[PDB]
């Protein structure tokens, strides 16, 4: 249902979170289009302490490296 990067939750803006066997992507609900999970496709809401089934993962920041 959600992704827990660093003490926070991360819900998809549109689509579902999937993983083949090792890496997590976010994709649409009618066509398999995997994408790299960044801060643009997810919105933070919560504290990551009430959600059930949340995995940790590592999200990507597209601004700090540049």
């Amino acid at each position: 249902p959600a992704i827990c990067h660093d003490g926070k939750a991360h819900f998809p803006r549109e689509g579902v979170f999937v993983s083949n066997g090792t890496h997590w992507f976010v994709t649409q609900r009618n066509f398999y289009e995997p994408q790299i999970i960044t801060t643009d496709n997810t919105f933070v809401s919560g504290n990551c302490d009430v959600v059930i089934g949340i995995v940790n993962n590592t999200v990507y920041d597209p601004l700090q490296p540049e």
Partner: protein
Amino acid sequence: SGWTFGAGPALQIPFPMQMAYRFNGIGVTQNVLYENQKLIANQFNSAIG
């Protein structure tokens, strides 16, 4: 399978995710359900009883 079996082949999906998408279909985002799951389930059980 939600409503996905009304168009083509049935696709499995966890019930909480389907409920979250139904809530998102009326303008309320997913975090409301993902943080009030227990309360909503209790209310639904009380109503169905």
